[PDB]
Amino acid sequence: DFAKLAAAQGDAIDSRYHPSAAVRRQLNKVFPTHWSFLLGEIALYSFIILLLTGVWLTLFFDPSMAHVTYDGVYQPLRGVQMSRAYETALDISFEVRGGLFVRQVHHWAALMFAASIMVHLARIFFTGAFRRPREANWVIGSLLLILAMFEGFFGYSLPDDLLSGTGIRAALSGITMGIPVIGTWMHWALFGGDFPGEILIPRLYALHILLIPGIILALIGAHLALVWFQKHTQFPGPGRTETNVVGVRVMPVFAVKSGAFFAMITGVLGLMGGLLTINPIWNLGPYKPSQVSAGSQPDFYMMWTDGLIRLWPAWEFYPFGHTIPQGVWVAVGMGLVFALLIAYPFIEKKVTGDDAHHNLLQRPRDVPVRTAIGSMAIALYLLLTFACMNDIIALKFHISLNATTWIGRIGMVVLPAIVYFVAYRWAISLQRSDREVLEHGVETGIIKRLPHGAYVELHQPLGPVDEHGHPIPLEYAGAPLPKRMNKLGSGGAPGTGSFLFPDPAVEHEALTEAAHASEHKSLTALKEHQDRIHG
Amino acid sequence: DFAKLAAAQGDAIDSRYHPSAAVRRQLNKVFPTHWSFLLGEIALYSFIILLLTGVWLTLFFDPSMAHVTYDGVYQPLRGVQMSRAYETALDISFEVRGGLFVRQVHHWAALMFAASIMVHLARIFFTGAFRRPREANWVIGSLLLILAMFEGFFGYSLPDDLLSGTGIRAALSGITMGIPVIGTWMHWALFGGDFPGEILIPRLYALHILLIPGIILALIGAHLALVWFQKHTQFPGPGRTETNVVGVRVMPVFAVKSGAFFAMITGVLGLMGGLLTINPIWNLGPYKPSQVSAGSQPDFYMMWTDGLIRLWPAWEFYPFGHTIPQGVWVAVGMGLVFALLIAYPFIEKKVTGDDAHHNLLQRPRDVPVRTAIGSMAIALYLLLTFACMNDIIALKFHISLNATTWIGRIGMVVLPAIVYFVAYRWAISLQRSDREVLEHGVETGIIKRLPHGAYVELHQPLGPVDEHGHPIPLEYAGAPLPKRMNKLGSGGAPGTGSFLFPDPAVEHEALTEAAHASEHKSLTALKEHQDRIHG
Ligand SMILES: CC(C)=CCC/C(C)=C/CC/C(C)=C/CC/C(C)=C/CC/C(C)=C/CC/C(C)=C/CC/C(C)=C/CC/C(C)=C/CC/C(C)=C/CC1=C(C)C(=O)c2ccccc2C1=O
Ligand SMILES: CC(C)=CCC/C(C)=C/CC/C(C)=C/CC/C(C)=C/CC/C(C)=C/CC/C(C)=C/CC/C(C)=C/CC/C(C)=C/CC/C(C)=C/CC1=C(C)C(=O)c2ccccc2C1=O
Ligand SMILES: CC(C)=CCC/C(C)=C\CC/C(C)=C/CC/C(C)=C/CC/C(C)=C/CC/C(C)=C/CC/C(C)=C/CC/C(C)=C/CC/C(C)=C\CC1=C(C)C(=O)c2ccccc2C1=O
Ligand SMILES: CCCCCCCC/C=C\CCCCCCCC(=O)OC[C@H](COP(=O)(O)OCCN)OC(=O)CCCCCCCCCCCCCCC
Ligand code: HEM
Ligand code: HEM
């Protein structure tokens, strides 16, 4: 008797505790059903997959520089001096069933985690989901993005490898040791001595399995709690105002679709872990200071820092008996990037002057300057990311390496400006398109007027029509407009039988009539709620 | 203008978010001010200190069996093959400034964590805090205790040492291989091979710094949330009923005293880490299968399992072509111990019939059978612990080793019975003493009657006095009774000046009558609330 068991367990729960009111509040909480609001959920799910795979990896990984001859199963690396970290990473890859798959899906989950954090940041920045409220949420999210970047940096550096060890030698050692006043001191504190210090990988292992992931988990908890109790903002729409949340309740629809999205995201990650090879450490021999490859790139999230290193024009300063290497330039650049990213909402509010409590998002077109600035920043980030890849770009796409380097150098001041101007004008022209649609109706097929040979597009007004043909122009309301009769009630009722065969006419008529009635009911409910709110 | 800054920050917080009602609820939450309710806080604080010191330790610890010659500073161990784990533990002890202190305070915090968990378990069990509302809390707390025990095991097993290594060899390896159908398979899965498998310490390091601490943190969060929302139970008292919490609010008093208690617990643990030497691994050479020591004990929280191993009388069964060693006996014993501990509240309610919502604690005297059973269990646990220590007990206290082993064997069935009987009768006699006080008043000095030579103790009634000398007996209300006029309004007004010199008589009188007024005001307020609840 499952129903009896469920009722008895509910009574027991509500007797031991009294969670009825709180649980009802959680279930009734309404969440907007916009697709762009699942971008953060992508990052959350990738983080969960990262945790689950990381536990499995920690069950088999041994962090240490203690030198060992492989004497394992991978023949091409046998009798070669390697660290225990590399040896156990190879053991995971080869001598543990499914270990290669687990580490590959872990690395793919890391890449998706970074990418989805970046896409979520784009969404919130361009839709203005940070101003007045949620500004602290944006701040902690920026901290979270930085932590994710460095977490992946320590992760793919964890198995002592030629590629990743070269990346460590470049960034962690050179940049740290070039910093003027305390650079060498920070280097020695971090590495326990010179660069190959015997504690680097154990320290990174601690940082990467417990310390940084613990902070990421705490900040994700704060992030999700803030989103939960500072009700999710929504785009302007029919019944959507600054003092309501139009969407679907947590229990029936939102919960099921979020769980299904989690399932699909982990399916994509597993499929990629299987079919796409990520970080073949067996190909990448053990780290040796004397050995190196030509690629020498970090993961795509640190690729912009690496590209900054490559592009910056070798400017070094030599004060009285001292040196200020080019590493400090990139270090200060990263510091500025992170400071600006963290402090943007406060910078934006100081500049514009808007401290009003904003709960309705604004379409990126409706804010030309901010969308222009975001496009400029994304252009700079892409420029740096491809500058880091200039080696392979030059190799495959036949362009001289010096040409790629100088293309990056010139573009990082030219391309951001070009993209800013183009994005600003593009946003304003999207606004102009919205206004033309508002004042003339949607466009359709052309008709030749009866008496004379006039051609008229035969528009379709979106609002009340004046006594004569032309309609009364509507006022923009911050919400998307239908620019194709395609997406309106025009040519959208195919025979509802099947792909191969029809259904009985009675069933088809019943189905289509019921669907039309449901559409009428939904639109009327939205219209009446909107009228009640604004009247 | 700190006041203005605080006001502006509060307004900004209440504008961005709306935490006014929730924060007021948290601040106004009332917590009973009984000392025994700080026992769980002791464990929580020791856990926090454990986290803080463990992060520092992981910054310097390298888990690996990779063999290395020390070549450090510690002269007595130079050129000796040791695992990198032992080498880095020695590096923490000697090479790192304050590393010895950090690891010692970490181990002392582990011992205090186990001890305070045990004391808190005793408190709740004997006071009946596990009844209907909080059996789930009891269950998760039992899981927490088990996790704490095993994490301490893995923690003092992390630095591969002679003592910890032989303890691992005995408990983990032997008792795992002993298990009949899957013992050897479990051993091979855990160690990745034979006992000295080269993944054991990395696996334990992961389990100990990330996995088990994560589960313990989640369970402590659930525990504290349950205590917070299922308002803390309280002992019977003047104004205390099953539907109220008499105590102090969170903000002014409880928060301050809890923070101060955490400070003092940290101070005790730091003082111990300084003055008392805990696990001096340097005296203990690196683990070798051949080297041994006479002591060979685990930490006190696993000493009971070790004592079970020692005492259980070598009963092995040999099915058709197989063996069932004596280790499986102890494995089943531990299983039974944990199962009974976790399932006691449900066992208690099945036995007694209590399905009532209990919010008033029971005095251990007021619940004899449960008090007797708890005393019996504590006696068994102490017998097992001292049986594990029987080696050192025999060495120092001159008792034959065989004599101690057989004392343990006989007493593990005799001492529990003796302690059960004694505790049951002791509880009933405490009840009898309480009723004697209720019916005769508190006892005082003797007086010789005027006409004849009778001697009367000159009692002091605690309630209304009959028309004649003898008082009207009061009804027992589950609250402690004052058996000394010491603790009542008698002999409690020393000169309030100072230790060496007095104060002006006007000041002394003002202070003393102010205190008298305050204490009688408190008594009257409690009395009025008690009368108001029913009257
Ligand atoms: C720092 C910086 C940007 C320096 C400049 C160097 C650079 C990137 C130049 C552009 C690269 C191109 C497009 C070369 C082709 C020749 C060329 C320049 C033609 C004119 C360009 C132009 C304006 C054309 C008009 C129409 C148009 C927009 C055409 C674009 C055509 C292309 C190539 C589109 C895709 C862009 C693209 C993927 C460029 C390479 C960038 C990267 C990082 C590829 C990564 C990558 C590589 C490198 C693999 O080898 C590989 C092997 C197996 C599986 C996967 C991959 C993989 O994903
Ligand atoms: C399994 C099992 C319990 C087997 C029996 C072995 C055993 C514990 C026998 C009892 C030990 C005793 C009390 C020996 C003294 C001789 C004796 C038996 C006298 C008769 C006992 C009796 C009924 C006396 C009447 C009055 C009475 C109650 C006297 C008790 C006297 C004592 C010793 C009280 C304290 C109890 C106690 C600490 C016993 C030893 C237990 C342990 C584990 C001590 C651990 C310990 C040791 C071993 C150190 O060397 C040490 C060195 C430096 C700093 C700290 C320590 C430290 O903590
Ligand atoms: C060789 C080898 C080892 C292979 C394995 C690889 C490995 C190591 C690990 C991966 C293996 C596993 C275990 C994969 C599956 C992971 C997993 C749990 C998937 C669940 C998805 C699934 C099976 C769905 C079935 C379809 C179905 C009926 C769905 C509805 C019922 C379900 C499952 C609902 C789940 C709801 C859900 C995702 C809860 C997540 C809980 C968390 C952390 C947060 C909740 C939460 C969410 C989800 C928000 O979006 C949100 C947005 C704004 C503010 C707050 C929140 C918030 O608090
Ligand atoms: C990849 C790209 C790089 C990354 C890009 C992200 C960084 C943030 C982006 C842009 C910041 C500059 C914005 C433009 C600032 C406008 C200047 C001005 O002239 O002030 C006019 C305003 C309007 O006032 P109004 O009553 O509307 O009158 C209309 C008059 N025509 O005045 C004010 O309130 C504000 C005056 C002071 C503003 C100070 C803002 C900067 C604070 C320091 C942070 C560092 C900035 C880094 C810059 C890159
Ligand atoms: C929080 C976000 C995280 C990110 C972005 C991340 C990223 C990465 C990446 C990219 C790798 C390289 C894998 C490879 O090269 O095969 C890695 C390795 C590893 N990660 Fe993480 N990780 C995260 C969290 C975790 C967690 C929570 C754990 C433990 C529970 C963990 C444990 C490990 C281990 C043990 C390795 C070494 C595997 C190997 O050497 O192949 N990671 N991580
Ligand atoms: C939660 C309860 C915990 C308990 C009961 C516990 C217990 C112990 C004990 C008794 C030791 C032996 C120390 C020595 O022999 O000097 C130890 C070692 C260690 N603990 Fe834990 N610990 C806990 C949590 C943690 C956490 C959270 C971390 C990491 C953040 C950690 C990291 C370490 C490390 C790295 C060692 C080895 C250091 C050494 O060998 O000296 N512990 N643990």
Taking an 8 Å cut-off on Cβ atoms, the answer to whether B199 and A63 are in contact is no
For residues A23 and A3, give the distance between their C-alpha atoms in angstroms, rounded to a whole number.
19
CB atoms closer than 10 angstroms to residue A334? 17
Q: Chain centroid to CA A511: how far?
A: 40
User: From the alpha carbon of A53, which atom of ligand 3 is closest?
Assistant: 8
Q: Which residues contact A228 (CB under 8 A, 6 or more apart)?
A: A29
Q: Which residue, B474, B426, B436, B482, is CA-closest to B126?
A: B426
> In the structure, how many helices (H) and strands (E) does chain B have?
18, 6
Within-domain flag for A484: no
Within-domain flag for B112: yes
Q: Identify the H or E element spanning B56.
A: helix B39-58
For residues B460 and B485, give the distance between their C-alpha atoms in angstroms, rounded to a whole number.
8
Summarize the annotated binding site of A as residue ranges.
40, 103, 106, 120, 123, 208, 223, 232-233, 279
Burial status of residue A291 (CB atoms within 10 A of its CB: 0-12, 13-18, 19 or more)? exposed
For residues A80 and A282, give the distance between their C-alpha atoms in angstroms, rounded to a whole number.
12
3-state secondary structure of B103: helix
Domain CATH code at residue A283: 1.20.810.10
CA-nearest residue to A228 within chain B is B17
Within-domain flag for A94: yes
Place of tokens 């001159």: B398
Cα separation values, B138 from B44, B342, B360, B379, Å? 16, 7, 16, 21
Please work out, in degrees rounded to the nearest 5, the angle formed at the alpha carbon of residue A234 by the alpha carbons of A233 and A240. Answer: 120
| Chain B residues lying within 8 Å of A199, measured CB to CB | 60, 62, 88
From the list B15, B16, B203, the residue facing A59 with the nearest CB is: B203
For residues B102 and B83, give the distance between their C-alpha atoms in angstroms, rounded to a whole number.
21
Q: Evaluate whether B204 touches B491 at the Cβ level (below 8 Å).
A: no
Residue B250's identity, in one-letter code, is V
For residues A531 and B302, give the distance between their C-alpha atoms in angstroms, rounded to a whole number.
70
Tokens for B206, please give them.
């992961």
Q: Quick one: CA torsion of A480, A483, A485, A488, rounded to 10 degrees? A: 0
Q: Say how many Å lie between the CA of residue B50 and the centre of ligand 6.
A: 7
Q: Evaluate whether B38 touches B261 at the Cβ level (below 8 Å).
A: yes
Residue B158's identity, in one-letter code, is L
Tokens for B260, please give them.
């101060």
Q: Chain centroid to CA A231: how far?
A: 21
Q: In Å, how far is A214's CA from the nearest CA of chain B?
A: 9
Taking an 8 Å cut-off on Cβ atoms, the answer to whether A66 and B64 are in contact is yes
Among B393, B402, B404, B407, residue to substitute to test ligand 2 (most atoms within 8 Å of Cβ) = B393
Cα separation values, A223 from A171, A216, B122, B449, Å? 30, 10, 39, 79
Within-domain flag for B113: yes
Within-domain flag for B279: yes
For residues A148 and B55, give the distance between their C-alpha atoms in angstroms, rounded to a whole number.
19
User: From the alpha carbon of A113, which atom of ligand 5 is closest?
Assistant: 5
Experimental method: cryo-EM
Cα separation values, A255 from A2, A46, A222, A474, Å? 22, 18, 20, 37
Residues of chain B that touch chain A, judged by Cβ-Cβ distance less than 8 Å: 15-17, 55, 58-64, 66, 68, 84, 88, 132-136, 198-199, 202-203, 206, 209-211, 213, 226, 229-230, 357
Q: Which residues contact A154 (CB under 8 A, 6 or more apart)?
A: A204, A207, A208, A212
CA-nearest residue to B210 within chain A is A210
Q: Say how many Å lie between the CA of residue A428 and the centre of ligand 4.
A: 20
**Which numbered ligand comes closest to the C-alpha of B406?**
2
Instruction: Spell out the SS3 assignment of B458-483.
Output: CCECCCCECCCCCECCCCCCCCCCCC
Domain with B8 in it: 2-430
Quote the longest CA-to-CA distance of chain A. Answer: 94
For residues A431 and A437, give the distance between their C-alpha atoms in angstroms, rounded to a whole number.
10
Please work out, in degrees rounded to the nearest 5, the angle formed at the alpha carbon of residue B150 by the alpha carbons of B130 and B82. Answer: 165
Taking an 8 Å cut-off on Cβ atoms, the answer to whether A199 and B55 are in contact is no
Phi, psi for residue A419 in degrees, rounded to 5: -70, -35
Q: Which residue, A426, A435, A517, is CA-closest to A126?
A: A426
3-state secondary structure of A241: coil
From the list A62, A134, A135, the residue facing B64 with the nearest CB is: A62
Within-domain flag for B505: no
Cα separation values, A384 from A150, A155, A406, A418, B535, Å? 17, 22, 12, 16, 79
Within-domain flag for A521: no
From the list B62, B134, B226, the residue facing A64 with the nearest CB is: B62
For residues A100 and B365, give the distance between their C-alpha atoms in angstroms, rounded to a whole number.
61
Q: How many domains, chain B?
A: 1
**Which numbered ligand comes closest to the C-alpha of A49?**
3
Q: Evaluate whether A127 touches A364 at the Cβ level (below 8 Å).
A: yes
Q: Which residue, A72, A28, A16, is CA-closest to A251?
A: A28
Helices B300-311 and B326-352, axial angle in degrees (round to 10):
110
For residues A349 and B324, give the distance between their C-alpha atoms in angstroms, rounded to a whole number.
74
Q: Evaluate whether B323 touches B312 at the Cβ level (below 8 Å).
A: no
For residues B30 and B13, give the distance between their C-alpha atoms in angstroms, rounded to a whole number.
25
Within-domain flag for A236: yes
Phi, psi for residue A248 in degrees, rounded to 5: -135, 150
Please work out, in degrees rounded to the nearest 5, the angle formed at the alpha carbon of residue A460 by the alpha carbons of A455 and A465. Answer: 110
Ligand 1: does its nearest atom lie under 6 Å from the Cβ of A396? Answer: yes
Beta bridge partners of B484: B443
**Which numbered ligand comes closest to the C-alpha of B402?**
2
Ligand 3: does its nearest atom lie under 6 Å from the Cβ of A268? Answer: no
Place of tokens 């499986």: B328
Tokens for A459, please give them.
């528009």
Tokens for B517, please give them.
């007024």
Burial B353-387 (b: 16+ CB within 10 A, else e): eeeeebbbbbbbbbbbebbbbbbbbbbbbbbbbbb
For residues B475 and B455, give the distance between their C-alpha atoms in angstroms, rounded to a whole number.
28
